[PDB]
Amino acid sequence: SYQVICRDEKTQMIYQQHQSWLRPVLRSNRVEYCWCNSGRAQCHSVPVKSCSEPRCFNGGTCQQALYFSDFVCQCPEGFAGKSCEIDTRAT
Incomplete structure (x- = not known):
């Protein structure tokens, strides 16, 4: 429905x-x-570019679109959170 x-x-x-x-x-x-x-x-x-400030931490990289305000956040390692401030793998 x-x-x-x-x-x-x-x-x-x-x-x-x-x-x-x-x-x-x-x-x-x-x-x-x-x-x-x-x-x-x-x-x-x-077209896209790099965000004004790296919103992703611990190695992640922020990217923001050129015309809109939509942005995606990359963050390898395997931690958690948008800024990856939550690490569970490493102490």
């Missing part, structure tokens, strides 16, 4: 009806702005 589509596995985050997220590309250099639309996922390439 209700409707709630668009989930994510790369970033590991769910998005309900009429939501939006970023899906960085691979070698190209741009990213796509995927805005859910009844399970249609409206993505499209857009």
